[PDB]
Each structure stands twice: as C-alpha cells, then as structure tokens.
Amino acid sequence: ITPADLLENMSPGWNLGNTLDAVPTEGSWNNPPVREHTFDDIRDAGFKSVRIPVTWDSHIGSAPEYPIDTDWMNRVEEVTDWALEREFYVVLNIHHDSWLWISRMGNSQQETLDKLGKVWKQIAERFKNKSERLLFEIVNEPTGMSAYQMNLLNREMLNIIRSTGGKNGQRLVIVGGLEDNKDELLHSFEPPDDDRIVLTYHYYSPWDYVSNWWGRTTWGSAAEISEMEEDIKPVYEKFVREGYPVIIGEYGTLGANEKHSKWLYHDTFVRLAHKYQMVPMWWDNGNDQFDRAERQWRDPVVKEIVIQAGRGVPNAIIKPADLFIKKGQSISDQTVDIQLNGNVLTGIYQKSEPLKEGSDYTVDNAGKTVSIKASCLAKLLGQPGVKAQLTFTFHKGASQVMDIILYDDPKLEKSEFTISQSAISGDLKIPASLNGTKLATVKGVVDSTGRPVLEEVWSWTPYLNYDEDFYEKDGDLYLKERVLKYLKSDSTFTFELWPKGVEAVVKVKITP
C-alpha cells in the first residue's frame, strides 16, 4: 500500500471525539454514548474514514494479567463494527491512557511496558479477524518517556500485534514520535522494521489561532500560509516520498469563530495535506462541528470545504463571509472578493432564488470581484441579526454562504460589577443585548498599573483565552471564575466584538 493508495482510500477522515475516550467512561464528558445512526450521518457527509479514540484505563483489571472488562470490550467492538459496516476505514487506538498511566514509563518502565503489552495483546486478539479497513494506532500523544523508550514501545507493541498472526500479520499499524509531534517524528523517531506501518502526527498550528488565545482572532497572511506549508513539507520529503503512508490523526480549529479565517484555514490545510499525500483526520469533540443530537453540522460550509478539499478539489473562498450593516447607515454598493482557487462563479442565490447579474450584482472580467448593488442590499435587509444569506455557487468545490447581518450598538444593562474576593463562586454573568454583534475576544487590564489582569500567567498581553477565561452564551457575556480569582484591584475588561471596532467595556471593582 502506497501513500497514494492510503490517501485515495481514507481522505477525508473524522474523529469520534470525547466519546469512548472520555474519563472514566463513555458518556462521562459532553457526548452521550454514541448512537448507531451517528455513523450513518458521518457517511452521509462524505467522510471516507473515522478515528475512534478509546481510553481503556478504568476498564483495565488488576495485575498480573490486566484483564479488560468484558462489557467494555464488547462495547468497543460494537462501535467499531458499526463504523466498519458502513465501509469506513477505521482507526482504533489507545487514547488518554497516555497520561492517565502510560507516562509512568519514564519512572517505572518494566511495570508499565509489561502492562501495555498485555493490554495490546488483548486488543489485537479481539480484533484480529476484522477486515483490512481496520487500522491499529499504538498510542495517542505519548508522553513521560524518552525518545528511546518511545521507539522501544513502538517496536514491542508492534511485535505483539504481529505475533498474534492471521490478518494482524499484515494489518496497518500506526506509529509516531513523542506527543504525536511532527518535529519528534522528523528528529527523534525511527521507523520500526516493518513494511505495513503508517506514520502519524497531529497538527494544531498556530495554537493561539485555533484556540482563540491572546486575541488571535484571524488567520491567513501570506507568511502564515507559507509557514503552514513549510511545517509539513519536510514530512513529505523524509517519509512520504520514501514510501511511508502518513495519517494526520488530528487537525482543526478548537473554538476559533471568525468564518472567513476558519474556512480559509481548513481549505488551505486540507489541500496541503492532500498535495503531500497525507490523510487528514478532523478533530471533532462533539461541540465544535457536527451536532449529533440535532444531526446537523454547526458550520455546514466548513464541513463541505473539508469534504471537497479532502478529495483534492479546491474551494473558492469569499471575503467577507459575514457582512455587517449598521442600523440607519447609508447604503452603498458592496464589494465581495473571491479567492477562486481555479474555480468559476456560476451564480448567487437567496434560498433557491437567483440574483440578476447586471441589476442585482456585477462581476469584473477576472470573475473574482463581485459588486452587490445598493438597491439589492436594501431589499435584503428592523430587528438586528442575520437578515438574509447569499449562496455563491461554483462549477466545482463547495458553495460559499455570506450572511447579511443587521446590527446596532450593543447595550449592557449593567457595565460595572463589584466582586468580593472571599465570595467568588462560579462565573460572572454580564447580561447584554448584543444587537447583532458577536463576541470576538476579551482583554483585561489592572486600572492602577495598566498591566494584564492575568500578568502572573501571561506577562506580555492583556488578552484572555477563549473558553478557559471567557465565553458568550445565549446572548450574554461571561468571565470565567478563573479570571475573577486573579483580580487584586479594580480592573477594566474590554469585550471586543464583530464587526471589528465595536466593543463593550466592563469595569470590575474588587472588595475583600
């Protein structure tokens, strides 16, 4: 099996995150135990492969044999079979065991490695006779051991798998370096002597963009795009063109919410993975992309981008993706720029009704610049929010959808809060009427000094981090308890919104 064969068979992939990998068991985190029909839903979307992370920890019995709980093994087989019966290529692994107990390798190798061997022999034996579309991944983000120990661990677990024989003699086995890190793979890793292995790494760069840390709310400079390619090209050069298939076991955004950047990031990364013959598997923890309960994608466009790009089909990208019009403003013609990426604009629709080229909109000769006429905009537009959506269709690749959003100045019922340090318990709710605007990022500054509220954590910036420090929910703004606990004296928080330049300033007073 060549790297090209694996790409053709597996790209694009999707992770069943925070499910069988949850702790202590399936359903312990934000997703319930997976329903069979979720795999039908992922099939409907067009993914060719799924990764099923599994944390075995609480289901492993005592020394010396470490028997895996029978009901758990039955459940993992049930879920694995559901995926396989939908003709997916399927990745089965050992997941959060990596830090729950495997990272004891450094301090206690002989006991830990013995235990891991007995665990993998049990997994290998149960799944020995499954079709070749099932792949084994030795361990997720391995840590707490040397590079030498990592290479030993890969070799020993692979030997155990091979030794069970039958189809496990030829089954694809996925290995990587420390922490599934790309640089470890390139510099400390050595491939086991085996001609049926696949190499892996995870990719989440830039971390502060994908996680919306420190106010890094956009992505896509020429340098950023160049740096993304230069990141992964050496893996192609050292391994792929030497015949090693490669799986990017996880990639994707982790809270970043700006549409244009998110779409551009996914199209760019997946196209680069495809170019260099690496299978991209999308990280979905159940909150960020596919809504399993509603059985719908929270961002259908970014999903369609991954589906097309993962098949080697470039997607056109429009800017802006969100058009903000302020209540009362004078209306003029609106320019939308299109990064065609080889594609051809075939129309612009509202619902399934087409706009008229000439009177509703015009295009330049290149076909990459669209002017939506003011009179058309006026018709599409008194309550704030998304008033209309324009769907740009292309001959090939995903459609682009532009929200036309009416907004007005956000209003807060209360913009000053007093907190007692001894009485802190849970997040601070800041009721708001955002009037069509959306939360982008937040910074926090100590009034008397002008220094960051979180200076003891991040010295160089006042900007806070999405989710761990702040969030928006049901139209209200929140500061996490974490932030409140760092407050020493009166501070000012700036909630920066979309559209760029609109913000809401909140003062927080501190008492004992």
Ligand SMILES: OC[C@H]1O[C@@H](O[C@H]2[C@H](O)[C@@H](O)[C@H](O[C@H]3[C@H](O)[C@@H](O)[C@H](O[C@H]4[C@H](O)[C@@H](O)[C@H](O)O[C@@H]4CO)O[C@@H]3CO)O[C@@H]2CO)[C@H](O)[C@@H](O)[C@@H]1O
């Ligand atoms: O625990 C009860 C409580 O759980 C809540 O669910 C939380 C979990 O508590 C929390 O541990 C979990 O954090 C996940 C995160 O969502 C994943 O995106 C992340 O994925 C990792 C991946 O596993 C690694 O292989 C990879 O390389 O890095 C990515 C990204 O970091 O893994 C972490 C766990 O380590 O998130 C859950 C949802 O917020 C419930 O919501 C709550 O109701 C429960 O009371």
